[PDB]
Design a protein around this ligand. Sequence first.
Ligand SMILES: [Mg+2]
Ligand SMILES: [Zn+2]
Ligand SMILES: [Zn+2]
Lengths: 56, 140, 69, 19, 46, 56, 266, 112, 115, 391, 147, 118, 49, 233
Amino acid sequence: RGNLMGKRVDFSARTVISGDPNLELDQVGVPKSIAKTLTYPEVVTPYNIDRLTQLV
Amino acid sequence: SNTLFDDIFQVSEVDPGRYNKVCRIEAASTTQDQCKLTLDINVELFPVAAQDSLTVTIASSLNLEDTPATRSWRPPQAGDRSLADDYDYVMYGTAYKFEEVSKDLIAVYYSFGGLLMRLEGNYRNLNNLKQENAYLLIRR
Amino acid sequence: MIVPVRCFSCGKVVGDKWESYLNLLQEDELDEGTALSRLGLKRYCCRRMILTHVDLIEKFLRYNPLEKR
Amino acid sequence: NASPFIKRDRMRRNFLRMR
Amino acid sequence: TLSHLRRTNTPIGKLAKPRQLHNTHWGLVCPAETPEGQACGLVKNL
Amino acid sequence: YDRKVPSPTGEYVKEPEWVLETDGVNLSEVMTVPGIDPTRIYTNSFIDIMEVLGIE
Amino acid sequence: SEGPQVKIREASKDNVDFILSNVDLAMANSLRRVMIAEIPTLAIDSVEVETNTTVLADEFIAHRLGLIPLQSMDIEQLEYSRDCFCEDHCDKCSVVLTLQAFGESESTTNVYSKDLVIVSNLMGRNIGHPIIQDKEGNGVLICKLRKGQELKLTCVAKKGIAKEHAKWGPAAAIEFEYDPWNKLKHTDYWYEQDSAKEWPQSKNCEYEDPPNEGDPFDYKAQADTFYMNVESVGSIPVDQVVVRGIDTLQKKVASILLALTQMDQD
Amino acid sequence: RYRVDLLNTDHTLDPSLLESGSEILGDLKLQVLLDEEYKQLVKDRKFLREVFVDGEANWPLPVNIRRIIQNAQQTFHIDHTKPSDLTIKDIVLGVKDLQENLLVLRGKNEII
Amino acid sequence: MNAPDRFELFLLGEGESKLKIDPDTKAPNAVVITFEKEDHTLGNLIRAELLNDRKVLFAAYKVEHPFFARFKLRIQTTEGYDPKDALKNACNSIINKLGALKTNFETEWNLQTLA
Amino acid sequence: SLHKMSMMAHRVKVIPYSTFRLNLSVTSPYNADFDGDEMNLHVPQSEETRAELSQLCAVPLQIVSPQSNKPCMGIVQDTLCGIRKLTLRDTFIELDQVLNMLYWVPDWDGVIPTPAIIKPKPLWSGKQILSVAIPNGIHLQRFDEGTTLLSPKDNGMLIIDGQIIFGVVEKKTVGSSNGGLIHVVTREKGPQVCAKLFGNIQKVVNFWLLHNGFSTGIGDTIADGPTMREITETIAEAKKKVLDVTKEAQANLLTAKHGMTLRESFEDNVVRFLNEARDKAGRLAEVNLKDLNNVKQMVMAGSKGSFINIAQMSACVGQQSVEGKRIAFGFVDRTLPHFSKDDYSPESKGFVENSYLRGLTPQEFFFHAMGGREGLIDTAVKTAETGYIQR
Amino acid sequence: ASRHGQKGTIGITYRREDMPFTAEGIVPDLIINPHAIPSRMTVAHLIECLLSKVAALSGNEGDASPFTDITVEGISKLLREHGYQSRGFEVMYNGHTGKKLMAQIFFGPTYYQRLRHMVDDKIHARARGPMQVLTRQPVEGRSRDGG
Amino acid sequence: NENFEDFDVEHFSDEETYEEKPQFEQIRRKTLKEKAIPKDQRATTPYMTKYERARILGTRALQISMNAPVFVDLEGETDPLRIAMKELAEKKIPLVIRRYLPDGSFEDWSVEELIVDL
Amino acid sequence: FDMGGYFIINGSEKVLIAQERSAGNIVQVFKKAAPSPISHVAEIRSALE
Amino acid sequence: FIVEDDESLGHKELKVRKGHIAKLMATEYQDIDVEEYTWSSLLNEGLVEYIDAEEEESILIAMQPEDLEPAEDVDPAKRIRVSHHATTFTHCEIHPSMILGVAASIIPFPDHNQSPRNTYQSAMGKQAMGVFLTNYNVRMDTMANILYYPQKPLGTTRAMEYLKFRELPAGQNAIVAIACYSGYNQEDSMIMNQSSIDRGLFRSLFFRSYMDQEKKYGMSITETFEKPQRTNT
Ligand SMILES: [Mg+2]
Ligand SMILES: [Zn+2]
Ligand SMILES: [Zn+2]
């Protein structure tokens, strides 16, 4: 129950929450430092070679 | 374009309700004994009392010409001649019910943005009213 | 801990009025409201700035200094 | 109604006046 | 610090109801001062 | 109790009805006494319901 | 002149009280917001602490020093700090002040803002002076020193607006009121029995005719005749507050015009 | 609300409701279909009163028929003054074979 | 720590302009201008003065988020009238009225001698 | 995270502060309040899990809860109060504000609706502007008590082709209720249109409430003189009835109800009298409160508070109960040492007659503290026990 | 948090020119929501705000002891004596447009306490970090960059 | 450490309460082809479910993200998920779905023949 | 303003929380449950100092 | 307090009189030269008595002396006072507000609140931020939070004068509007004036102390506080 059936994970973030009437219903406001920390591995295609090169 | 309905009504009673800006008036036609009117009036722009004669006019449009809202409303330019110029109080709203009170008595329901108006009477003059948007034109 | 320089809401400079407020209190025998009205604090934001301020600075100066020259 | 203020300096001066 | 120096502690295995405020607690412990945790009513402040 | 009974006109009328409430569960011989409806007798304890009536 | 009209009711050293007539509501509110947040002003921005044996923290003293109102008459002649060619600060875009206070007295020594010494060359400008308002002659009480305590530090004062930080605000509180008789019905007075009784009349009610209580609601009436009271913090005189606010708003609209003409040729 | 008679007048249908409303009166096969529908409704009422002994009408059910009816009314601008285009045989057959399309189980054997 | 350093309320960032005029496809003769590094102070004033114009059908502004100092202002005018020209006329009118307000204020201040 | 709606998939908007910011309407399924709640984030690292998170766990796809076949999200709090205030019949919006409200709707088609009042001044009603947020083809009809096609109370609802005909928009309309606007829109238009509706209504109502203002104050909990006297008379006559029952029971003339002792029957009668007294006093206070009363507006909006909150703040807190009965004799034959022995008067056993506005007597304060302590203990044990049951 | 159990976080921060303001130019330091009041039935928050307003105007600190004979009506009379509305409402003006707010706003000083739950001590994120020695799972605690 | 009166429920925490109360075939067999139900007698729904559509979108977007040949015309779209939804829109996803019955048997449904109504 | 009332142990300010206990040398009578064969129990927690 | 029969006035009366109170204030003001009159002076004269919960079982206590003691038109704003209609009191409460603890004595008008809110505030006041001791500059405590500008509350209790709360406060008097301003304060959020934050509203210091120690694990297994170099570390 502590290490197998549920466990601690990476690529997670935790902070306090605030209301935002100007955000959409399905939209979340992520802090910039959290966004600078959490990453998503994106596979290089011709469709995103320029964008990924610019990000690099 | 033309006046779909027009009559002279005698305001029997003005009910303020719990609204301090809107009063629901009770009116009966003078010419026709079986036509009467209930209508909500924004009174700071058009103050009415009991026993007031009102020229109630329902038209499908305000321009003086015939009909050709699917067009965006715009502020009236200077010199624009409309049917509203001859009336002291103009509403705009939609029909939402045509229920028959009797064999001859048809009642028409109009909602001007939430200001409700029930007009009933015989159908030989109310037959002009259908399911469209109508302008309610009032002068005192 | 020491009197704030400016009122929190409006920003009127009240940090120069603290010692004059003390003078209006302790030897002129005025009540606090007349003392604030004397200093021109007519908005109650400035009035709660001077009235509610507690001066811990004298309680801190009672300690012997850590570096004495 | 009663005065809703903690004003204890003024009865301090008053009690010193009786003293 | 003042609140911490006047705390009590009730070590809870019996069948009584030691968590609810009792009538005899009048004027001896605070009627409304207790943690919201599992020590609610057990930790009382004089 | 006020049960809803189909009226002979077709409607459902709120017919009042004398209902006996009991504390302490016995069912096997309580359902066998005359003057009652043993087809409508209900018990708070579903365990005795399972033992006496059945699993369904 | 045709346009907005100004009639000052009360002019003081740090308070103008004027009636602003024949003007739209949005222009009055925008002018109010501009004198609240948009006027450039000199204020202490960076503090170089050399000796601090006080009982207060270093950045505590720095934050107190930032809020000291500095004289800002010739603030237009100064240049913006990032807009200058210099490395960190110079006399063209900054004013350097110093503060050397010692506890030589047995009693507690008060460090006032009048103890600030300007060490830069002003080139004849009228900026950098700490503002003295009280009759005592001192300034804002910066800190206190007992015997043997020393405070030596260097302040670099740059210019900025209150949007960047409220220490650059010369605004204090700006009173602002239109239609004291509620003739436009922009408010519905909460009441228990009589809204004319629980609500005290404002002092500006004397400058307008009370409603006739039988006349109809003038729906064509619009908001004008604004009652404004501007309070100067002390950095600039209050007339200069209003004038520089009009300057800043006019320059913002002119910058919009300039950007529009600049993209227009493209 | 439910019984329609094409051979009598106590439960007759007004000919103004539909264009095939005058000459439909006095038909036999359509009356047979209507009697079958009314018998089905009576059996349905008996079954429902057997199931819900409290006579509770409101129950959680999948498809909101009323909203679909109102959407069709407002989509096609039902003026309720023009006689309806529907023949009653088409209505009966449509209601009957709609139930065949309501497929929860796609098995092709008896018990399924 | 995540707070932006607060000159970004009124400093034009690198590689971006003061204005961004984008035509509006929803209505004929309508554009949306994104003002960058301003807020309600300019937006309300421009909106009201554009509403004072007679050949302007629509005029509205909105600050979509208080975090970012920007607002989108939408103008729809009558046919044959450029919304850019309406914006220029509104800005010119504001300049003229602010100048008149200025001159009135200094003259009527110089009338005051109790300062 | 007791249920599946309490952890869902959102879309990132990078913001320059230190908080997870999120819509107000989504806080109800999370059971989240901004009093310092932490709330976790998880980022999928693969296209498969990203796709199934977007297509299975997304916020709009789970608007309607399978828990109780009704929407779990709705218009709440300030937006609910402002949408009630906006759709009143008194509310008319001028052109300058109307254009800003129209531009605040992102999917506004760019046509200005014709005003409800053309002359002598172009005025749009609040229902007229709110109907712009409602997409076309939506038909909702609801009749309350006393609701006809003419609505003197403006209760119920009627929406035709996404246009509000009458009725104030309330918790029964845009709240998390079955058959409301949210349920109808997400069943006829889809989840994306319902999420856009959430955003549009929130934006336009929040803007109008910003330029309208809404407050509450100490004066909103104050009943006037005659109503306060009427409340005092109700409490006094209930005390008279309780005293008469006490005198009957002390002469043993009080019969015992079936299966229940003289003590329990007497206590049942006393508690029944005190509860109906508190309800009657609260009803008197609620009838007193004007439509401009802020707490009254919030109660009829359903955004916060209830009838009993008005009753306790303004008329009478009521009888304090511990474990279902009145305040027991913790001392010998008395509740407090400030009462004599064998006192069964309502003030002696935990009936608080004063309102929160007038403040509590110290005996009433201690009794209410006992009741609140019971509530806190019940909450603390119930949370752990129900988590146990759920796992 | 206030002194009445009305805790919460800062939603957003506005500058002075955006906040509402009285006819005297006083802006709030802090705006709470009306919805915190009726569900919690926190009347003493409102009474403390009223008494604090009267105290700031008069200069005498307010007596807020529980079981005194201090009524809201006396505080209302004292507030009305200072030229303000007796129930503490004020005519506010919108910060953005300068228009009067249609509903008057309850206004006044209220003693608030800063709590120690700063977001900077609680914000936490981890993409990849150290492992536990035993289970080879992410470690515990934001101080160790945990999972 | 820390001393917080702010009652934060430490979660997944019911074993305090566990310790409080601790006392109280013939059609298909093996791996034959009989598990593969023929297309003529498939008894599952022709409607592709929400989980089926989610996994097809995930698999197709994963393949497209690794240079699988896109079988629809791109409209300048670069995101693999929207390309996958475009492929699903005109049934150009070359996948079939193996719906396993509880007995171990299965049916094969192509994405082309599955009705996408949701 | 420091009031004392605590111990300094290894430089840590330690406070002894008052442990609350039932009194000794007092007779208390309790009613046990029905399945127990004993109806009432009189108990004293006899204590000497 | 002690209630005696007091046959001089013909009814029960507190043994404390105005003379004893005057002696008490004389001693208290001389502390700020007469005969010393302390709490023990009242204790030794039979004026006050120590009562525990057993002795509370056999006594009758009055709320207030001026209300319940003398033998018995009313203000409609006041709360309803019951006089209990009985005059056989043995004791009187010193003050009813003294039934509260330290934390609950900070709450202004706690009798006007729902009791769980008072409990929440009592728990929350320990998490308040402010000056905890005047010698915080010389204490190397592990964590220390000190407000910049603490202010005594405008609405203050008589009880907190004895808690020295007016000398070491834990908050500020903030001008508070109760408004649905922009939808950013909904449901336990606030909108705080950023200009006020710039001017020092609720700004506070935070001290953290790091303790490190060098120890000898044996003869040569020890460590030294030194600046390491990349060549040899
Ligand atoms: Mg929470
Ligand atoms: Zn101020
Ligand atoms: Zn330079």
